[PDB]
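Aim 2 progress. For UDP-glucose:anthocyanidin 3-O-glucosyltransferase, the working sequence is reproduced below.
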Amino acid sequence: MKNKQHVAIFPFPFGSHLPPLLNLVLKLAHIAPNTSFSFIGTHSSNAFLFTKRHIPNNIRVFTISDGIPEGHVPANNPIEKLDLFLSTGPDNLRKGIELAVAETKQSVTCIIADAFVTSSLLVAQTLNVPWIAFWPNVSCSLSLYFNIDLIRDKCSKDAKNATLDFLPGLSKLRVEDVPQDMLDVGEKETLFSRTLNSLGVVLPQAKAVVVNFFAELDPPLFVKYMRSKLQSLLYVVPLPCPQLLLPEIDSNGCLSWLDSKSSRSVAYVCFGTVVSPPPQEVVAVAEALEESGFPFVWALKESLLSILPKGFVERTSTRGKVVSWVPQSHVLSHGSVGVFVTHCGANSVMESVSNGVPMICRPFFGDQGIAARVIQDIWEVGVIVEGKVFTKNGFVKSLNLILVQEDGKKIRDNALKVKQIVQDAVGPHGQAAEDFNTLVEVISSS
Ligand SMILES: O=c1ccn([C@@H]2O[C@H](COP(=O)(O)OP(=O)(O)O)[C@@H](O)[C@H]2O)c(=O)[nH]1
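Predicted structure tokens for this construct:
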């Protein structure tokens, strides 16, 4: 009998949403070489993922519109391109289905999609195939979308430090941690925010929800609560499969520089690929790093070099490296790194906890605030920077606490314990290995 299984995949075609989904598809394609996987992105997302990359013969890449008409120039803000893509609706996605069907000569039997591409659920329903939602954001934020009215009410009435006890397992979360996106009502709403707010209604329609994280790290009560809301909740280990990686390079010599440093002594600083930090906070980070005396690696976009203090890079040249880009996952895996100063993007957080590196957190947008709260108050593997924004004195204090002070010992110890938990979770007999098998069988059975 001819195998005719054919999975169509729709990433949210933007930045750090891309590698985690390719990673899952590579693992699925490897274990089911007789199954077709059709990865449907935009011209820009495909260039981002596939330019210098060999892919398995059962993965094929297709291109759909990004929703930016020729001639249009989006404003310099992270949401516009997201809105324009989402505005293309299910018909754009169905152009991708068409291309995949024409190439494979196989009808689609199953769709895997980043949960933000809610239009692909309509596509799956039209085709009468299961829809599998992929969740690469902070795992704990799933609960928010089932409690929007309660959350809005509490954020409008109660104190900023009031806890969200009505969320099972997440009583440590506070009003101040809530994504502003989900509170905005009226002109401030965007197609993006409206799409995320629909997740409470969208996600229970998924055959399964696949979380790009470790179940062992989420509060068990939160996991139980989410199971009660979904048809199936699966946790597939987010660590990279062999074929996701390129040969590691180091054009800045970060790793060799780190080799010259002592165990857990270096502060690694990075705000990710999206955050445009306030210039005043960039200056504060520099002043604090210099004042602290600690060795540091700061991955900083080169457009921001002009606003660093005059002579800062030069004065700190013998103890610090300020560079445009680093192999971050390999930097975080280096024994010399003692703290990660982060915006708390989900992928950065994953890389940090899996490598036993404690964090100093300054969440900027989206669900970073949720991640920061989990890091400080649940896992207890880091702190939210003193004052909630970078200041020279506050950041210096946070650096001292984690890197050197006896008062930071508990956090340092916890980071190591969490690393061991992750190491024990990725084993062949782990529940995550079972969840992966479960997902493979959903695809097989489709
Ligand atoms: O100099 C850098 C800066 C970032 N990253 C990677 O970019 C991703 C950042 O995604 P995250 O979800 O942390 O935040 P975002 O950039 O999407 O805000 C992570 O995989 C980082 O390891 C990197 O490799 N080198």
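The first helix runs from residue 18 to 31. This observation will guide construct design in the next reporting period.
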